[PDB]
């Protein structure tokens, strides 16, 4: 697992 502000695995533009 990783800590992200925008997304780690999911995130569509």
Short mmCIF file of N, CA and C in Angstrom, two decimals:
data_model
loop_
_atom_site.label_atom_id
_atom_site.label_comp_id
_atom_site.label_asym_id
_atom_site.label_seq_id
_atom_site.Cartn_x
_atom_site.Cartn_y
_atom_site.Cartn_z
N UNK A 1 0.85 -1.22 0.00
CA UNK A 1 0.00 0.00 0.00
C UNK A 1 0.87 1.26 0.00
N UNK A 2 0.35 2.32 -0.61
CA UNK A 2 1.05 3.60 -0.70
C UNK A 2 0.13 4.77 -0.36
N UNK A 3 0.72 5.86 0.14
CA UNK A 3 -0.04 7.05 0.51
C UNK A 3 0.08 8.13 -0.57
N UNK A 4 -1.06 8.47 -1.18
CA UNK A 4 -1.11 9.48 -2.24
C UNK A 4 -2.18 10.53 -1.93
N UNK A 5 -2.00 11.73 -2.50
CA UNK A 5 -2.93 12.84 -2.31
C UNK A 5 -4.03 12.85 -3.38
N UNK A 6 -3.65 12.50 -4.61
CA UNK A 6 -4.59 12.46 -5.74
C UNK A 6 -5.16 11.05 -5.95
N UNK A 7 -4.30 10.03 -5.81
CA UNK A 7 -4.72 8.65 -5.98
C UNK A 7 -3.55 7.69 -6.02
N UNK A 8 -3.80 6.45 -5.57
CA UNK A 8 -2.77 5.41 -5.54
C UNK A 8 -2.88 4.48 -6.75
N UNK A 9 -4.12 4.08 -7.08
CA UNK A 9 -4.38 3.19 -8.21
C UNK A 9 -5.46 3.76 -9.13
N UNK A 10 -6.51 4.34 -8.52
CA UNK A 10 -7.62 4.93 -9.28
C UNK A 10 -7.43 6.44 -9.44
N UNK A 11 -7.88 6.97 -10.58
CA UNK A 11 -7.76 8.39 -10.86
C UNK A 11 -7.84 8.70 -12.34
N UNK A 12 -9.03 9.12 -12.79
CA UNK A 12 -9.25 9.46 -14.19
C UNK A 12 -9.21 10.97 -14.41
N UNK A 13 -8.69 11.38 -15.57
CA UNK A 13 -8.58 12.80 -15.92
C UNK A 13 -9.70 13.21 -16.87
#
